[PDB]
Symmetry: C3
Amino acid sequence: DISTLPRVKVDLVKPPFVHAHDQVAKTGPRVVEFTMTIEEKKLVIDREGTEIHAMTFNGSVPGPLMVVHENDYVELRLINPDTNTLLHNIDFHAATGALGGGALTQVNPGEETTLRFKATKPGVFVYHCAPEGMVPWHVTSGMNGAIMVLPRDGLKDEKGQPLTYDKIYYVGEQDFYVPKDEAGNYKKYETPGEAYEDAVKAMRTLTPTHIVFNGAVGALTGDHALTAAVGERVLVVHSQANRDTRPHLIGGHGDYVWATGKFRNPPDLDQETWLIPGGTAGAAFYTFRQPGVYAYVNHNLIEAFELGAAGHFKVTGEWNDDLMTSVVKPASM
Amino acid sequence: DISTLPRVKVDLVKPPFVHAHDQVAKTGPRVVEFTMTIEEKKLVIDREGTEIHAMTFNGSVPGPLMVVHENDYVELRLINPDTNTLLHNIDFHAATGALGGGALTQVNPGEETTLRFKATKPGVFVYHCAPEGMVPWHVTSGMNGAIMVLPRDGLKDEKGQPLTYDKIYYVGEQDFYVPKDEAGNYKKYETPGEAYEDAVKAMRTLTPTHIVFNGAVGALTGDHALTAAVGERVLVVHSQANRDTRPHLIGGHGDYVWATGKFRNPPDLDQETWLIPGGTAGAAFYTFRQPGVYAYVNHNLIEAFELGAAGHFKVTGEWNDDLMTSVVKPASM
Amino acid sequence: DISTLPRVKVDLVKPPFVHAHDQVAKTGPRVVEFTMTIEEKKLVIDREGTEIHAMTFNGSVPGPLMVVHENDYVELRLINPDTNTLLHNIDFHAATGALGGGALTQVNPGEETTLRFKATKPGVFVYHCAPEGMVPWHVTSGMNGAIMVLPRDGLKDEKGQPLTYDKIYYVGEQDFYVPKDEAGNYKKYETPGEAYEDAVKAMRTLTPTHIVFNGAVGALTGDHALTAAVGERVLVVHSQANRDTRPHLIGGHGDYVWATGKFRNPPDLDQETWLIPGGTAGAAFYTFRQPGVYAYVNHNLIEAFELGAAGHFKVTGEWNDDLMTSVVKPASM
Ligand SMILES: [Cu+2]
Ligand SMILES: [Cu+2]
Ligand SMILES: [Cu+2]
Ligand SMILES: [Cu+2]
Ligand SMILES: [Cu+2]
Ligand SMILES: [Cu+2]
């Protein structure tokens, strides 16, 4: 009887940060309550000032990371305010039935709904909007995020020993298809509704115009670079709701990687680069051993450095010359 | 001595159905006899009435699923009737030597041939036509299918315990490259031979115009939706002879998945989405837990919902509110 | 103290061949010394005579395969002669810190540098140039290769038993983006520097014009086909620094495959085709069982047979009719 279970309310945070949670469950199963408000909004996605009409869960691209444990119930209150113009819903890849919840969560502007589902499978999973007839348009306008369902006894390595992270970040990667005119300039629009047939044409090229982390070119750089210290254990959850990606930590590795994100499987060890298929979330665990700047990229390097799929870590601490050193610094001959 | 072995003749069925077979072998090794007749034919592949000159094994796209057991011999009589115009052959990825059989099976119109090979490796495998100099044109005109080589003791999970399916379906996914004129309309042709240089140009874009299950947009919907009941164990074999795909059962999971299709490896558990590389067959096992409509898609959602790579399951049975429920149905605030 | 370790100097060879090494380490940890000279040079990449300005490590596309053992130190002297025009550096995916060495190895024409790093993780790994602001242009001009870090006790199968190869080859796969004019002809250039904005435009299409093994269409055919004998155990290392590939041995299999190339993981067995993500090296082990010609391809067959990603093995020895035979040779009805 679900009414006898504890309820706990989560207050979400903006990506790439993740709300507070316990890796090993400190209670029995709970109903974990979340609220998200859909926001259609203009977003500037690149250095040139290209502006799109984004569709968001909770104001961000990606939507926030939700965290529960296996066999918890997730109860989501989904709000579509009357300041929006479109019908929306939500499909959780973590859930079982009704198109992942999509069939039960159709909300017009001015409506809300509450969905409950049991988190029966541990892993990181995509969630996304999926309104009948409009699915890729909503997804590729930014309306996707992820949910992490931890095993009740936390993460384990390939031998069944505990893995405990000190820090966690969520990197949502988004493919955008901004319509272009024959000369190649982006076509701008006043409303989200304006784009439709041109949005379909741009998508059908299968060639994104931008591929970004956390909603914009350079979002995870500068003052917004990810941080860690030498010796810290970091889990990076990465999702892509529509298109394959291949993450790589330049200067590091994925020490333990669940490329397709499901924790009942042993992790792959010592990865340089890993493939996360479109429609999937994956997770990589790394212990930093060197200080300095690292680039975290999609290792199609065109997609990274021309189209936007690159972020930075800034790592503090002690340099280890046994691991790497310049024997003879660049100089003339 | 092969002449001392039992011979058994299989009568193939049209995809997505699969001919009768036993999961656990009830006899010793056999010579399993198959016959396929090549058919070049016009096919209408979309709702708009786009017509291509398809090249088929046995009249269908994909070709039918063949099923044997490890260490059986497959004996295929391949018939190219004189009503066809092109030379064809067959490459089995399950086979060892002679380009998978391609070098030994070149048949002009009005010829036939019989190939035998030993099925030494268990798994699902692609087969396709591959005539020298014309390989991608034949493959992307529909001339591919798959073969399943079951272990003699059937399928096993990651712990070595039996997995038994109640139903099996074969989903062949096909990328088509219909030539277009400068304005973007499809160029139509009277003969298969007509297309050649324009077919090459269209392929070189690396951008399919259509991506379909079972030969056409909407083929696995309506009266032709896949079916199951709550509690049934279903194996879905999925192939793509030329291009990567990422299957996903919307509202379900792959409980056990062999993404690259080879049964001596343990399955991956609890997949949301899995990558089947081009030139590979994969297999996913799921036990249905909820009734209703499910969408089975390539989770590049553009490829699914714009280009055609989507089918449906219709599932009968009892709804489980513990797994999912609408707490508050969509309503105004 | 590194100064107390043996030093051993390696003399590299041109791909697809690999310098001499021992699978099981016959010494303790060593400093393994390598020298590479950067060469910007014109290369003809196809049958039509298309000429690009390539950027190479040691004169070849790919750069040579380096081979060490786990916990060796790699010491690379990297030379940028004053006959080149561009700044270059090197990022080793095998290394830890400083962008894989990229931050410590920036050499202008007329400079050299010496980098040392400890090879802490066993596997095959990509290395590539990566100068700030110019990364995909250098990589897709050919400036990448791979390094193999063998476990000190050699390779093992999925049960922990030894796997010993008799022959090893290195197949580097390169995506090129040759700029085209509006009519579709390649734009030619006098200097590497000439291309820049047009190179960026061509890359942003995400559609390579050529995809080649060992630097050119047909490079691994004819007198330069790979060779083996029936019964020989062959390891094929395959890298792709920028874009996904899906290798397949037509007429064979990958008996043991590390698709993402990291030897602490068990291999996948009996693969038909495997996905190596862009930015990764992988390795496949096969024992040949049949003589004749095999085609080794990227199994996007358009990429293989139209764009150039195909090579051949020529295999000597005895045909096994139990594995495959023509029962009835192609003939009329
Ligand atoms: Cu929406
Ligand atoms: Cu989905
Ligand atoms: Cu054919
Ligand atoms: Cu093939
Ligand atoms: Cu360079
Ligand atoms: Cu790299």
